[PDB]
């Protein structure tokens, strides 16, 4: 009357192919965060996600149908990459790589890829910091996680630096800046220009508190 075991299988602590409804919720959340920039990713990764997305929405790649011009790119990429050369061609190569995988397999692999990035689950703020060796402010991504703070390249999304929350001695904000003091771990403060210093401070406090209450129980 039917065989469950003919299907793709994968289960880890984050996601599970055997729970379709829960999986779709996980997929929707992860995809939205990437498409709208809440989860910043590199160009290369965006196209990989896009390729899984295409498999999910269109099924297996059909080369004479799914070609440059077919996609509404803004539906498949973070805005940053919509106008970048060869975007669509990259997406379709990743789409082709999916072969005949099912919708569920594609969703599992999308969620897995998202969770595999260091940027997963990080709240990022676009700020300006001093440029190395220059009296000049340039853009950068400042991320707050459950247990750390990280500097990330706004273009490539490379993680440039990461400080554990346990190395942060104190922090301060003004309506135009935000500053971290790492006490004995390094000589100089880290300050950036931003109008969102208050939000940043609250996330940091909030996350420290969650950790301080783990120790208790």
């Amino acid at each position: 009357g039917i065989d469950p075991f003919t299907k793709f299988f994968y289960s880890d602590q984050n996601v599970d192919s055997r729970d379709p409804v829960q999986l779709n919720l996980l997929y929707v959340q992860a995809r939205d965060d990437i498409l709208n920039g809440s989860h910043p990713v590199s160009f290369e990764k965006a196209c990989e996600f896009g390729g899984f997305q295409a498999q999910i929405q269109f099924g297996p790649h059909v080369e004479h149908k799914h070609k440059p011009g077919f996609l509404d790119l803004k539906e498949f990429l973070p805005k940053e990459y919509i106008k970048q050369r060869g975007a669509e061609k990259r997406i379709f190569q990743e789409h082709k790589n999916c072969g005949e995988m099912s919708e569920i397999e594609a969703k599992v692999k999308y969620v897995k890829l998202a969770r595999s990035l260091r940027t997963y689950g990080v709240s990022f703020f676009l700020v300006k910091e001093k440029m190395k060796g220059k009296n000049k402010l340039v853009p950068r991504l400042l991320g707050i996680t459950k247990d750390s703070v990280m500097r990330v390249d706004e273009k490539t999304k490379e993680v440039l630096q990461e400080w554990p929350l346990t190395t942060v001695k104190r922090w301060a904000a003004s309506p135009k800046s935000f500053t971290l003091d790492f006490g004995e771990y390094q000589e100089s403060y880290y300050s950036v220009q931003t109008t969102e210093g208050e939000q940043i401070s609250q996330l940091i406090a909030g996350y420290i508190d969650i950790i301080l209450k783990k120790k208790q129980s």
Partner: protein, 40 residues
């Protein structure tokens, strides 16, 4: 030229920030989970 005025502007913008950031208020006297390098 375009580059000259930009440079002047950028340096002023940097100088403004260096001054303003000293106005920041510390949101705590110390982080509860901070560990000295010798303790972590």
């Amino acid at each position: 030229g375009p580059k000259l005025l930009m440079i002047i502007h950028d340096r002023r913008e940097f100088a403004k920030f260096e001054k303003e950031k000293m106005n920041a208020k510390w949101d705590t006297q110390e982080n509860p989970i901070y560990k000295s390098p010798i303790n972590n």
